[PDB]
Amino acid sequence: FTPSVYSLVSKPLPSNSRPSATLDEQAETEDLISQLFDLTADPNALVSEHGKRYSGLRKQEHTQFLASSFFQLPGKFVSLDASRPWLVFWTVHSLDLLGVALDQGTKDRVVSTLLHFLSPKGGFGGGPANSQIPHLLPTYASVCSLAIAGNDSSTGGWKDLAAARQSIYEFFMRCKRPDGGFVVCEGGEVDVRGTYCLLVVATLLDIITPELLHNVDKFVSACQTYEGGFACASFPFPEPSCRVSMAEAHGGYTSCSLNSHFLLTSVPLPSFPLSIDANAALRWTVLQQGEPIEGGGFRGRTNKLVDGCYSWWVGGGAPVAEELVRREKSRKVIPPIFNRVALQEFTLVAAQQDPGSTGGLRDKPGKRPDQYHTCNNLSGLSIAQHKMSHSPSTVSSNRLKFDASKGLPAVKPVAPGGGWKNEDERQNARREIWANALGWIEEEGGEIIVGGKDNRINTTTPVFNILGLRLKPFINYFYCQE
Amino acid sequence: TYIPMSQRRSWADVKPIMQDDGPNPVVPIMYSEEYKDAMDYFRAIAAKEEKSERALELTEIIVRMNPAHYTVWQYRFSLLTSLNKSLEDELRLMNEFAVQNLKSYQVWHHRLLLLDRISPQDPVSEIEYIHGSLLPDPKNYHTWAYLHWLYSHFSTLGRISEAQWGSELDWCNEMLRVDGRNNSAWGWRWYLRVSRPGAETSSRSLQDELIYILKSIHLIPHNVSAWNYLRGFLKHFSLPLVPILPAILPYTAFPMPSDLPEDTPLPVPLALEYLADSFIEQNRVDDAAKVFEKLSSEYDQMRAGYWEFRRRECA
């Protein structure tokens, strides 16, 4: 049920005798990818043709690519000056996946740099707090990077995050809009990227309240389009009479919406979260996997082009949609849901930089590698290599070990009645949120490593996109479950 | 030759503030002299919260160097409102800015804030600009999202007339005529015809919509956009699949297929998806299973696992 690209017939998308700009770009991309596959040895073969490129994951080249980007960036990176915590996250998460350790001195530098991005009033910005205002996206990127590079010592940065919990929560509340959306920053745009980044951080740091979550589920649900994926945002027509989705289903926004909704399912509020159409989201997800001629990589939108970064955005959303589908069918009353083999083939054959060069991973052939595509190609490769499930028995096991008498101080709500009703409700909420956050498992015997075990990378966690070995100690610290 | 701001008479009173990275920062960017200097003085301006023309000028200098600098964009809009600046002048400046920076979240949001604040009685000029701006990239996501917001926001205020809605559908029809595989324009059609609050729903408007969809499929049988639209349409309006089946059956080998266009290999996977779902509608679970298995075995092997899942769902 997961055929290799090399075992299938490669045919262009048919024209139907009606040319268009879309088809011109598609045909061009089909040629580009198929030509590289033709020059490359089939990763599954014991005997390769002589003269053909070896597709093995060039981990040392990718490490060197990340090293160069890590200690000094050229002047043209100024376009990413407001995204510096992303550059950190893309680097440190990739190194985790590649299995490359940072020394303590380098880790300390990562922590210190990020702490300079934290404002006392609350939240991280894309640069130093004396230069940039807080933003939901750098807040996610900085928090995850601290999970990866930090620790519980006085110089480990986790201590500082714990102290910042109330201020971060207050920043989150300032971002809150009555319809359930959040501005990304003061005066900023409202979309599901904001919701995703906020919910991840609020989950990990134990700063979820009822007043934070009001309408949040409704905003996300109405982002779902007739295609089954999710758009950037929904518009509230004047609590609102109705909500209407604002653009196309996209991999970036579908990833954010599925992950957001999933995080909300562990919150014990009444009639919450408002349901999404899980079957349609799964359908949209699988339909975005490219044909053999385009290497089996994912595209981000119908009739656009395949791109390595969508291995994470679309591919990493698959286990989430699958679990939601599983729950929906259980509410009334196994082969892989996407081609796990083909996606790895796209990664190894098409998404790696040509050997003996700068290293790194990329959008597609003809595109320069960057940190963003390095991280998201690898995060997607991990999802394809390792069969991820959300396990009810693991969640149950987590519930049994949870210590509700241990925790950091409760957040003080903005509105007097914005918190949980009482301590029983609040502690039950903490238990459910923590227990489910640690519910993702790799299924033993589910592993598929295309090209041999030297291609194996570490296991990322769906929804959060950090390694489980980072997630567990991090969330245990803030919930005092260590 | 660059003249430093420390040598400019207009900035003599200002003491620049350095970037506070701390000791030995990771991912440092080697800034140009121009960008470092501008940011050194912006830090000083923002710190003292100066709202002035020189501060406004400085924000422009910076966003030109980094169109993604959300902090500086936020400060710029704050200056515009504080100084009661000409918002129409700013919108004109953004016309050039937006074309060169299609994927900038903050440029597009800046436009939104300007339109929201200007709040024109008739937004026709902006609608026209937006249509024009789509020439270099007909699929620019932020533009389509912005177009959705514009019509939704201004319709809420009761400022979109029936003539305006009508010409918008005409433009959308033209977009899909030029490229029927433009999924962004298909999405816009759904807003115009189905999702917007003021959209007409009658048995006759459904008829017209079916005709358009079917005609689109016959013109481009392998167009996933048209197929997805059809499936969304029937699902949204709770319409049975069976009565339309005659128009779709030929692809499994009201407007009907051509008496077939060249370069149309059969079967079309999504036509088989339609047929299997039509069997499901008829309680014929074994007939659906066989179609799903064929999609899994032969006709859409990339999705072998998903179609197998769908087959097991019948059994």
């Binding site: 992303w86 996206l137 990227r193 791109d307 970064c309 959008d363 963003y372 | 993604a68 994927k103 900038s104």
Partner: peptide, 6 residues
């Protein structure tokens, strides 16, 4: 034609 997430 780079990718932009922020």
């Amino acid at each position: 034609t780079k990718c932009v997430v922020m």
